[PDB]
Design a protein around this ligand. Structure first.
Ligand SMILES: Cc1cc2nc3c(=O)[nH]c(=O)nc-3n(C[C@H](O)[C@H](O)[C@H](O)COP(=O)(O)O)c2cc1C
Ligand SMILES: CCCCC[C@H](O)/C=C/[C@H]1C=CC(=O)[C@H]1CCCCCCC(=O)O
Length: 363
């Protein structure tokens, strides 16, 4: 009860100076899928010594994008271009994980090779009321009808995750995070409100987890458990990703990861859980997971401070506030003022405006 957001922490290999984490955040500045100086600049600004960072969602294969100008890690060109961003982070003594991202059905023909259909667990489109895919021209259109995968096809998509993880390390990354949240590919298998499968990848809760299990297994096999994080969001309806019982789902995922750590012999870097914005559900998964717990969603300083003090979380990741405040860790420390975030420049392509030009705190 004497631990705070500013207490040091040992994350297996990595000795952290504090608990404030940069949440993964799509910003769409990686023009044409390739990272650049602007990304290096933006992440560097946000780096503190012993500070932990999570990169924006990063493509694992052609077709895995549902956003314009998001970066990839499947090609050599991408690997080489990422090096500057990581080196920049390492220079300032921070740690960085590449989030491995497949959007599944949350895509468009535009982002698909040969203009194909996005792949998912189901053939059902995302409903057309609340949700629209954003296109390179800035317009918003309806999500198309996806193609459900053959069972035989899945081991290949898992191999895409392996290569991406192997590239990430080769590019200098300290590790990777599996994006299994927010209604993207993995979540489309996890949630029974999407996964209408007949086979071993659907039905029972154990069956809905089988996809993630394999993805986590293959990646851990490739680069070691200690360099792997997993992000899930059991209670988030984004893109029609509902479950009949989110608490049982979360606990089935938590349970899966525990029972995997015996099979491997080593612990994962962390489990990353996002809240929408009961609170029993979070505390429940925490007690249940044997390892580091990074909690996310709607946090400020006081909430983040009390989460650590009470043992609800080891680490707390910040999204919206970290965009507006490159030196957020310092601002929290001295209880300083916070810059407000501008929504309009979240997903614009400018290297500077709304991206790196958020001012540091004055001396
Ligand atoms: C502009 C923006 C982009 C985001 N992109 C991602 C992403 O690529 N991958 C991911 O797992 N979460 C993404 N998120 C969700 C954040 O990781 C985080 O969970 C969310 O911002 C809620 O936390 P907060 O209240 O501190 O902002 C994004 C959020 C925002 C606002
Ligand atoms: C001005 C707001 C634009 C919408 C941006 C929104 O935060 C969506 C972000 C998506 C992009 C990548 C992701 O991984 C998604 C984040 C999921 C946010 C879910 C909302 C949580 C809640 O229910 O409070």
């Amino acid at each position: 009860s004497n631990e705070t957001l500013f207490s040091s922490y040992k994350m297996g290999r990595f000795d952290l100076s504090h608990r404030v984490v940069l949440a993964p955040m799509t910003r769409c500045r990686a023009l044409n899928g390739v990272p650049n100086a602007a990304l290096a600049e933006y992440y560097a600004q946000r780096t503190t010594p012993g500070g932990f960072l999570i990169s924006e969602g990063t493509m694992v294969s052609p077709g895995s994008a549902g956003f314009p100008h998001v970066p990839g890690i499947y090609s050599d060109e991408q690997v080489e271009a990422w090096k500057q961003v990581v080196e920049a982070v390492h220079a300032k003594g921070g740690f960085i994980f590449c989030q491995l991202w497949h959007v599944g059905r949350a895509s468009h023909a535009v982002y698909q090779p040969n203009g194909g259909s996005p792949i998912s667990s189901t053939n059902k489109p995302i409903s057309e009321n609340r949700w629209r895919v954003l296109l390179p021209d800035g317009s918003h259109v309806k999500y198309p009808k996806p193609r459900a995968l053959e069972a035989s096809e899945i081991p290949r998509v898992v191999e895409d995750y392996c290569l991406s993880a192997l590239n990430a390390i080769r590019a200098g990354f300290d590790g990777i995070e599996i994006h299994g949240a927010h209604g993207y590919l993995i979540d489309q298998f996890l949630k029974d409100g999407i996964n209408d499968r007949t086979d071993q990848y659907g039905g029972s809760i154990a069956n809905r987890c089988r996809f993630l299990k394999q993805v986590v297994e293959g990646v851990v096999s490739a680069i070691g458990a200690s360099k792997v994080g997993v992000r899930v969001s059991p209670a988030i309806d984004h893109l029609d990703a509902t479950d009949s019982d989110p608490l049982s789902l979360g606990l089935a995922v938590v349970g899966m990861l525990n029972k995997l750590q015996g099979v491997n012999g080593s612990k994962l870097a962390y489990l990353h859980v996002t809240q929408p914005r009961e609170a029993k559900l979070m505390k429940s998964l925490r007690m249940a997971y044997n390892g580091t717990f990074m909690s996310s969603g709607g946090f400020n300083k006081e909430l983040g401070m009390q989460a650590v003090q009470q043992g609800d979380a080891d680490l707390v990741s910040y999204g919206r506030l970290f965009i507006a405040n490159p030196d957020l860790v310092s601002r929290f420390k001295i209880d300083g003022e916070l810059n407000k975030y501008n929504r309009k420049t979240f997903y614009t392509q400018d290297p500077v405006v709304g991206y790196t030009d958020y001012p540091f705190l004055a001396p």
